[PDB]
Design an enzyme around this catalytic site. Structure first.
Site, PDB file in Angstrom:
ATOM      1  N   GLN A 139       1.689 -11.456  -2.992  1.00  0.00           N
ATOM      2  CA  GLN A 139       0.299 -11.119  -2.746  1.00  0.00           C
ATOM      3  C   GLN A 139      -0.351 -10.604  -4.042  1.00  0.00           C
ATOM      4  O   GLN A 139       0.209  -9.741  -4.715  1.00  0.00           O
ATOM      5  CB  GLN A 139       0.260 -10.077  -1.622  1.00  0.00           C
ATOM      6  N   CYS A 145       0.806  -1.232   0.000  1.00  0.00           N
ATOM      7  CA  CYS A 145       0.000   0.000   0.000  1.00  0.00           C
ATOM      8  C   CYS A 145       0.838   1.280   0.000  1.00  0.00           C
ATOM      9  O   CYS A 145       0.578   2.173  -0.782  1.00  0.00           O
ATOM     10  CB  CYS A 145      -0.989   0.034   1.188  1.00  0.00           C
ATOM     11  N   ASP A 202      -2.275  -8.275  -4.905  1.00  0.00           N
ATOM     12  CA  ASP A 202      -2.729  -7.094  -4.181  1.00  0.00           C
ATOM     13  C   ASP A 202      -3.225  -6.021  -5.129  1.00  0.00           C
ATOM     14  O   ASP A 202      -2.799  -5.944  -6.292  1.00  0.00           O
ATOM     15  CB  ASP A 202      -1.556  -6.527  -3.355  1.00  0.00           C
ATOM     16  N   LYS A 260     -12.367  -4.712   7.572  1.00  0.00           N
ATOM     17  CA  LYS A 260     -12.228  -5.627   6.439  1.00  0.00           C
ATOM     18  C   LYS A 260     -13.275  -6.722   6.364  1.00  0.00           C
ATOM     19  O   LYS A 260     -13.724  -7.259   7.386  1.00  0.00           O
ATOM     20  CB  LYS A 260     -10.818  -6.232   6.379  1.00  0.00           C
ATOM     21  N   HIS A 300      -4.840  -1.653  -4.732  1.00  0.00           N
ATOM     22  CA  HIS A 300      -5.440  -0.522  -4.045  1.00  0.00           C
ATOM     23  C   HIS A 300      -6.234   0.338  -5.029  1.00  0.00           C
ATOM     24  O   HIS A 300      -5.737   0.684  -6.112  1.00  0.00           O
ATOM     25  CB  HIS A 300      -4.358   0.259  -3.286  1.00  0.00           C
ATOM     26  N   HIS A 321      -8.419  -1.564  -0.142  1.00  0.00           N
ATOM     27  CA  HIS A 321      -7.357  -2.571  -0.291  1.00  0.00           C
ATOM     28  C   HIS A 321      -8.040  -3.886  -0.592  1.00  0.00           C
ATOM     29  O   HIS A 321      -9.046  -4.212   0.047  1.00  0.00           O
ATOM     30  CB  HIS A 321      -6.551  -2.815   1.005  1.00  0.00           C
TER      31      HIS A 321
HETATM   32 ZN   LIG Z   1      -3.031  -2.581   1.352  1.00  0.00          ZN
END
Ligand SMILES: [Zn+2]
Ligand SMILES: C[C@@H](O)[C@H](N)C(=O)OC/C=C/Cn1cnc2cc(Br)c(Cl)cc2c1=O
Ligand SMILES: [Zn+2]
Lengths: 401, 401
Positions: free
Chosen positions: B141, B94, B143, B225, B145, B271
C-alpha cells in the site's frame, strides 16, 4: 560510544517494542540509511549482472516440505492458515527463486542465471536470544541464487568472492577471515562430487589470491560452503558472507533446463549473501563508525545555518541549490546562537555544517564546519557543492580537507 | 485484448501460482516497473514533505484489540503464534506509524508530521474472490498518516486531495469520480466527532469544486473517507485512492503532543493511499497501456542495433553512452536481418529502436524508430540522448515526434 542500541536511540534511527519482538520499527533517518545501503547493493547487482526479483511472504507448507529443510527447521518457522491450508512465512528466499526459474522453459543459453532479492525473511527466534539489530526475528538478506552448469561453478564462485571483497572494502573492512566448510558425515551425492565441489571453492579462492582455512565436516548435507568473517576497528569478528553450493534443492523442486546436447538437465545452485542481514549490517556499521556514518550513508548530509536572521534568504537559496544537486540537506533557521546550532548537529553526526554569516553572503561563499570540529574556512558555493557530490558519488569514507 | 495476465506472461513481468494464492512473484522486468513506480511515489513524498518509515510485519493481537481492529476484522486477518502469544500479520500500517510517533516527545512545532510507508499488508480474502493483480491477498500500500492539529485539518486534507489528482494525471487518468463514505453501523467515536469529521471532508470537496455523492454507511470504523475512482481507456471504474479523517485511533494508542500552550493534546490523524495497492495499480497500468508503457516505466527503454559486424564497436560504445546517461539500454549485435531484430523489440514493447549503419557510424548519428512504427530519421547522437533523458526525467506520456 559504540553501542548501536544507544546510538540508534540518540540519532532517532529505529526502535523496538515487546508488541513485535525482534521486528524493527525503522524511523525516517534509519530507513534512509537502509535505503541508501539498498541503492549501493543494487549498483553492484548491475555491475555483476544480476537480475532482481521479489517473491511473496508466504507459500504453502506443502511446498516447504519438499525442500528437505522442514524437518530440521519447523520449530523456527512462523505458520498461518487459510481455508484448510497451512502457509509458512518465508525464512529464506531460495524456494521462491526456484519457482521463478521454473516459469518458462530454460535452456543452457540462459545460464548462468543470477537472481537477487532483498528478501524479507522471518524466523521464530527465541525471545531471550533477541538483541538490537543483530539478533532479530524479521530481517532482510542481500540474497541471490545463481543457477548454473557444473562447468560454470568456479567462474561463478570466483565472481562472488570478488563481489565480497569489493563490497566490504567500501565500508573500510580490509581484514577478512575465510573458512571453507567440508563434507559432513551425513551428506548427499558421491565422494567424487564432493571432491570436485570442494576443489571448485578452493580454486576460486586461489584464483583471487585468498588464503583461507578449513572447517572440517561443517558443510551442509547438500554441499560445501565458504564463509567470510570481517573484523571491525575494535578487532571484533563478524561472520557476514556466505557462498553455498547446493546439489539438492533444484532436484527437490523439479528445476531443469534444456542442455546443449538437447537433454533435460538439473542446474547447480549457488546461494550467496554478502552483508547477510541488512539490519545486522547496519548495527555493525553503527558501531564501526560510532554513529559517524560516511556522507553517502548519513541520514542528513548537510545542515545549512544562518548566524542571524539577516542571512535567512541566502540560506534558503543555498538549501535549494543543495537539494537540486541531490544532497540530503536541511536548513536550520532557528533564532539560536550559531554555537548552539553547531553543537546540536555535531551531536547528531551531520557530516557538514554550512555556516552563512554576513561575510559569506557578501562574497557568495559559505563557511564549512565538519562534525569532527574542523573549520575548513569559507569556500565558493559551487565548488563546495561539486566536492560534496564527488564524496557522495564515490562513497568515500573520508570527509573534506 | 489488453489482459494484464497475458501481458504479464508475454513480457515476463510476474507470475502467480496455487502455492501462494493471491500473492505475486515479480520477475526482473516487472520488478523494474514496480521499483520505478516507487521512485515516482518517493519523488512526490519529497515534493509534498513526507517522511518515509517501515513498520514491523506482525504485531501482538493485544495491540490490534486496543485499536478496535480485532473486533472489526479478525476473520480477514492472518494470524500466527510464538511463545504462547498471538500475532496478526498486519492488514494496515496505521498502528505501527502511531508507535513510531509515540517515540520521543512531540510538540506542536513537529506538526503536521506526515509519515509514509510502502506497507506490506495481508488480507485473508476468500480464495474464490481473487483475480489477477486486481484482487490479491498480499499487497503493497502507498500509505501515509498525517498527524496534525485541528486547525491544520483543512490545509492537510487539501494537500492530500491535490496529491491525488497530481499523481493520477501523471498516468493520463483525468476522469475521476468521488464519493464521501459516512459513519458505518459498527464504529468508534461520538456522533459529534463523526459530525465534525464528515463535515470537514465535505467542505474540502466543496472548496475544490469536486462533485461527489454520499456513500451511506461505508466509512471506516474509525472515521469517514473520501474515495477516488479513476476511469481507464475502456471506461471501467477502478477505486484506488482514499483520504480518511480519524479523531479516534490516536487516543486509543495514547498519541499526544505538547500544544502551543503547555497542555497535553491528542493529534488528529489523516490516513491516505493514492495508488491504493502497488500491485493493483501496475495491473491497471498494464491494461491502460496494453503493455506499451511510457518510456520512464518501460523495463528496457532503448535497444541499439547494428546492420553488420562492421558497426559492432560503434553500437557497443553508443550503448555504454546511453547507460551513462541513466537509460535502460541493451545492444543487439546478433546476425539477423534488421526487420527480424526490430520486430523482436517491438513485440517486447521497447520504446525506441536505435539503428546504426555505415552512414550513421560515419556521421556520428543514429537512426531512430519508435515502437509504434514512426521513423524519426538519422539524428545526432547527443541530441537523441538529451531528448530521451528529458522524456524519461519528465515522465512524459508521449514519445518523440
Ligand atoms: Zn491508516
Ligand atoms: C544465502 C542464502 O541464499 C541462503 N539460503 C542462506 O540463508 O544462507 C545463510 C545461512 C543458512 C543457514 N540457515 C540458518 N537458519 C535457518 C533458519 C530456518 Br527457519 C531455515 Cl528454514 C533455514 C535456515 C538455514 O538454512
Ligand atoms: Zn538460499
Amino acid at each position: 560510544g559504540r553501542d548501536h542500541r544507544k546510538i540508534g536511540k540518540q540519532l532517532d534511527l529505529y526502535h523496538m517494542q515487546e508488541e513485535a519482538p525482534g521486528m524493527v520499527f525503522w524511523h525516517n533517518d534509519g530507513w534512509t540509511i537502509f535505503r541508501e545501503l539498498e541503492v549501493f547493493v543494487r549498483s553492484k547487482l548491475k555491475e555483476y549482472q544480476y537480475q532482481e526479483v521479489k517473491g511473496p511472504f508466504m507459500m504453502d507448507r506443502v511446498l516447504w516440505e519438499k525442500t528437505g529443510h522442514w524437518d530440521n527447521y519447523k520449530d523456527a518457522m512462523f505458520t498461518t492458515s487459510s481455508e484448510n491450508r497451512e502457509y509458512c512465512i518465508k525464512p529464506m528466499n531460495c524456494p521462491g527463486h526456484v519457482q521463478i526459474f521454473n516459469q518458462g522453459l530454460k535452456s543452457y543459453r540462459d545460464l548462468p542465471l543470477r537472481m537477487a532479492e532483498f528478501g524479507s525473511c522471518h524466523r521464530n527466534e527465541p525471545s531471550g536470544a533477541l538483541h538490537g539489530l543483530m539478533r532479530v526475528r524479521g530481517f532482510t538478506q542481500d540474497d541471490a541464487h545463481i543457477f548454473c552448469t557444473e562447468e560454470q561453478i568456479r567462474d561463478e564462485v570466483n565472481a562472488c568472492i570478488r563481489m565480497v571483497y569489493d563490497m566490504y572494502s567500501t565500508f573500510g573492512f580490509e581484514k577478512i577471515v575465510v573458512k571453507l566448510s567440508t563434507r559432513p558425515d551425513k551428506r548427499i551425492g558421491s565422494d567424487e562430487m564432493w571432491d570436485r565441489a570442494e576443489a571448485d571453492l578452493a580454486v576460486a579462492l586461489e584464483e583471487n589470491n585468498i588464503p583461507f582455512e578449513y572447517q572440517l565436516g561443517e558443510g551442509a548435507f547438500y554441499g560445501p560452503k565458504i564463509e567470510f568473517t570481517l573484523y571491525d576497528c575494535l578487532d571484533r569478528a563478524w561472520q557476514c558472507g556466505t557462498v553455498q553450493l547446493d546439489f539438492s534443492l533444484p532436484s527437490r523442486l523439479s528445476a531443469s533446463y534444456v542442455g546443449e546436447d538437447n537433454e533435460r538437465k538439473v542446474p547447480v545452485m549457488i546461494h550467496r549473501a554478502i552483508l547477510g542481514s541488512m539490519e545486522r549490517f547496519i548495527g555493525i556499521l553503527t558501531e564501526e563508525f560510532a554513529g559517524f556514518f560516511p556522507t553517502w550513508l548519513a541520514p542528513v548530509q548537510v545542515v545549512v545555518m544562518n548566524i542571524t536572521d539577516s542571512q535567512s534568504e541566502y540560506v534558503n537559496e543555498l538549501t535549494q541549490k543543495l537539494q537540486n544537486a541531490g544532497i540530503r540537506v536541511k536548513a536550520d533557521l532557528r533564532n539560536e546562537k550559531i554555537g548552539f546550532k553547531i553543537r546540536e548537529h555535531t551531536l547528531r553526526r551531520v557530516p557538514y555544517m554550512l555556516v552563512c554569516g554576513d561575510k559569506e553572503v557578501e562574497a557568495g561563499k559559505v563557511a564549512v564546519r565538519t562534525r569532527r570540529g574542523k573549520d575548513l574556512g569559507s569556500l565558493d558555493v559551487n565548488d563546495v557543492i561539486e566536492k560534496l557530490q564527488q564524496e557522495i558519488r564515490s562513497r568515500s569514507l573520508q570527509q573534506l580537507e
